[PDB]
Amino acid sequence: NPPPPETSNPNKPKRQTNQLQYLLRVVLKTLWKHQFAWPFQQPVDAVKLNLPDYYKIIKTPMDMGTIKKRLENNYYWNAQECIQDFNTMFTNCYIYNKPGDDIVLMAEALEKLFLQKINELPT
Numbered sequence: 240n241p242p243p244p245e246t247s248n249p250n251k252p253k254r255q256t257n258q259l260q261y262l263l264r265v266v267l268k269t270l271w272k273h274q275f276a277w278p279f280q281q282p283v284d285a286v287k288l289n290l291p292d293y294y295k296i297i298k299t300p301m302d303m304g305t306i307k308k309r310l311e312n313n314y315y316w317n318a319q320e321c322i323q324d325f326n327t328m329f330t331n332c333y334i335y336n337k338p339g340d341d342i343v344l345m346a347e348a349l350e351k352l353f354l355q356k357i358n359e360l361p362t
């Protein structure tokens with residue numbers, strides 16, 4: 240396994256916005272409870288999961304556990320930066336797998352819910 244993505248970075252400027260607070264309190268914490276959230280709650284453990292090719296294919300890994308800790312640490316400058324991490328997590332799943340795979344069906348459902356929730360953000 241590679242090191243998991245950073246959740247803090249002292250030379251990166253931090254910020255807290257109403258939209259970033261909403262991304263943690265509403266968007267992430269609601270998605271987290273979905274029946275299909277479990278594969279996305281932690282970095283992929285390629286040793287545990289017997290996926291020795293995972294990080295040969297996926298070069299920008301991302302997961303909701305990382306995103307959660309980034310939000311908690313005020314790691315992001317703005318909501319768009321956090322949204323990009325969700326999108327990277329979903330696209331990684333489509334890249335590493337195949338259409339119709341169980342894990343892909345899960346990501347597709349979570350992505351739809353994610354889009355529903357970010358359609359309207361606080362001002």
Ligand SMILES: COc1ccc2c3c1Oc1ccc(OCc4ccccn4)cc1C=C3N(C)C2=O
Pocket residue numbers: 277278279280281283288331332335336342
């Ligand atoms: C062949 O299996 C796959 C195949 C592809 C993918 C994955 C697979 O498997 C997982 C198994 C477990 C797991 O986590 C187990 C767990 C997590 C939380 C609570 C309880 N149990 C996460 C994943 C995440 C995956 N992602 C992102 C994939 O693209």
